[PDB]
Design a protein around this ligand. Structure first.
Ligand code: DGT
Ligand code: MG
Ligand code: MG
Length: 539
DNA sequence: GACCACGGCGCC
DNA sequence: AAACGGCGCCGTGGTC
């Protein structure tokens, strides 16, 4: 390419190099652009950012986030990664996409700019005539990238001092638990080493090894195994409590306070747009889609996620979302009727499982019921179901027939889904998002059946993900009109921040946008709450 | 210092 | 551990 002076013309493809992967923390090392047979290299990348009206190229969102961090409105536009990811969602990295579609991903801004240009041309070619994938690109993924850029750059407020206080308390309780474990063992050891624990539990003590680990065949020390031995000794009780406390302290309580950004005073995640096989987003650096909620200590941690002074958090979560989607996709009359009647399957299962009326079903019980319902749906064995529910085999198998006969057209949809997958090599969501599942005619049963469960899950989980992404695209402009912010997506949940004076209006509007995103054969319901912290906002 | 595989486990 | 699916990050253990 002809090396031309910097500024590039309108519509040029950008390339850029960051000191590290996180755009909120990265130094912009170099910036370049490519168009019309020329490459333009910026002499000083930060100043040169001002000359661009859009970020167009590989990893466009990342550059847009860094621009927003510097006070520039540089929205992300076309990204070949999103084209590639819609073609095949195993296209998750620029390294791979470049190799597959006509270049090499290097560490030079110029070459990344020229690569973005030629990869876009080629991938655009591949999507000609793929009208449904094009619709997804234009109406969901491309505009979603601009929304995510804003969410990333806004971040969330964290009660840092609260978590530092909590850390000191949790450390003392961990010491109490490990001290008791070491007494029961008769000696000290690394309780964080599952290899060392294995020896203690199954060799030194006499406890039965219930199961084996996948890759290396060691005797497992997982919670599922240890749950079976819960008063086979008092040491197991202590070990499980130790595991909870150490998991929460080392994953959330200690790391999160150190990730507060100096300019914003807030915690910033990355929403990864080409990371999953089903079309869900992911969150990393720090993952904010797996903040604790379930246990009392987990609830304490979640309370650290708070609103700006003068603002409130608004949390919105779709009701029973994949079951509603399944009703639409299968067209099962009975399941459609269940949601037209305003019934709640999770609560129904909880009430059944624990033998209490609906009014007595607590959050813990509801989460247990979710595992049963989705487990059963996505192909859990009778053998495992009988264990989970803690009842006989049959009762368990009868549960599976009671479930599937109640909704006869689900199985037919499953089988239809699998035959399309075997024939075309991929399955698809309602909107034509594809996942290639190659092993559906594998000659090994365990591998074939695993691929089957993957294949029929995706249209359901992926359609739910499509709905949420579309809702995000529609909602974002309405929020900024009202002076509200989108903070987090958690798969079927959104967390917004609103000025106190507008929070109730924001909640009502966001609820209606989410419910009417793309009407189905059943209604979508959204539970919404408002509060000073993330936990209080879902109560 | 980095990288990785693994078991394990937090959330959806 | 188990014929639920989708993720990312922890500490350990091993390597370069
Ligand atoms: N396969 C599988 N999918 C799950 C599981 N937990 C959650 N999901 C998926 C299916 C849910 O519809 C979706 C959103 O999770 P939620 O925790 O919000 O559950 P859901 O929306 O079903 O119920 P809700 O009314 O919000 O309590 O994520 C699980 O254990 N297995
Ligand atoms: Mg939900
Ligand atoms: Mg949810």
């Amino acid at each position: 390419l002809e090396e031309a002076p910097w500024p590039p013309p309108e519509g040029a493809f950008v390339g850029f190099v960051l000191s590290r992967k996180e755009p909120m923390w990265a130094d912009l090392l170099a910036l370049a652009a490519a168009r019309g047979g020329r490459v333009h290299r910026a002499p000083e990348p930060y100043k040169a950012l001002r000359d661009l009206k859009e970020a167009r190229g590989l990893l466009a969102k990342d550059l847009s986030v860094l621009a927003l961090r510097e006070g520039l409105g540089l929205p992300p536009g076309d990204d070949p990664m999103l084209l590639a990811y819609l073609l095949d969602p195993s296209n998750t990295t620029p390294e791979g996409v470049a190799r597959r579609y006509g270049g090499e991903w290097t560490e030079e801004a110029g070459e990344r700019a020229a690569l973005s240009e030629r990869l876009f041309a080629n991938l655009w070619g591949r999507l000609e005539g793929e009208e449904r994938l094009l619709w997804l690109y234009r109406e969901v993924e491309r505009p979603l990238s601009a929304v995510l850029a804003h969410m990333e750059a806004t971040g969330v407020r964290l009660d840092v001092a609260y978590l530092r206080a909590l850390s000191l308390e949790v450390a003392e309780e961990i010491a109490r638990l490990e001290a008791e474990v070491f007494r029961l063992a008769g000696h000290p050891f690394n309780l964080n080493s599952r290899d060392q624990l294995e020896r203690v539990l199954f060799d030194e003590l006499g406890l039965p090894a219930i199961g084996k680990t996948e890759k290396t065949g060691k005797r497992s020390t997982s919670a599922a195994v240890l749950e079976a031995l819960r008063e086979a000794h008092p040491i197991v009780e202590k070990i499980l409590q130790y595991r909870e406390l150490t998991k929460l302290k080392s994953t959330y309580i200690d790391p999160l306070p150190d990730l507060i950004h100096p300019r914003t005073g807030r915690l910033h995640t990355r929403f990864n747009q080409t990371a999953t096989a089903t079309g869900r987003l992911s969150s990393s650096d720090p993952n904010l889609q797996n903040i604790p909620v379930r246990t009392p200590l987990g609830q304490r941690i979640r309370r650290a996620f708070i609103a700006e002074e003068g603002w409130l958090l608004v949390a919105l979560d779709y009701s029973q979302i994949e079951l509603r989607v399944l009703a639409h996709l299968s067209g099962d009359e009975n399941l459609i009727r269940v949601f037209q009647e305003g019934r709640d399957i999770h609560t129904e299962t909880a009430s059944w499982m624990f033998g209490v009326p609906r009014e007595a079903v607590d959050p813990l019980m509801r989460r247990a019921a979710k595992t049963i319902n989705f487990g059963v749906l996505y192909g859990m064995s009778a053998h495992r179901l009988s264990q989970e529910l803690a009842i006989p085999y049959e009762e368990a198998q009868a549960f599976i027939e009671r479930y599937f006969q109640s909704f006869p057209k689900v199985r037919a949809w499953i089988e239809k889904t699998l035959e399309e997958g075997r024939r075309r090599g991929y399955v698809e969501t309602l909107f034509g998002r594809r996942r290639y599942v190659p092993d559906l005619e594998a000659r090994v049963k365990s591998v074939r059946e695993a691929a089957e469960r993957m294949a029929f899950n995706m249209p359901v989980q992926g359609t739910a993900a499509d709905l949420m992404k579309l809702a995000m695209v529609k909602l974002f402009p309405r929020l900024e009109e009202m002076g509200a912010r989108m903070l987090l997506q958690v798969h079927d949940e959104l967390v917004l921040e609103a000025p106190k004076e507008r929070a109730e209006a924001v909640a009502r509007l966001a609820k209606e946008v989410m419910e009417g995103v793309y009407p189905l054969a059943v209604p979508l319901e959204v539970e919404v709450g408002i509060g000073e912290d993330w936990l209080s906002a879902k109560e």
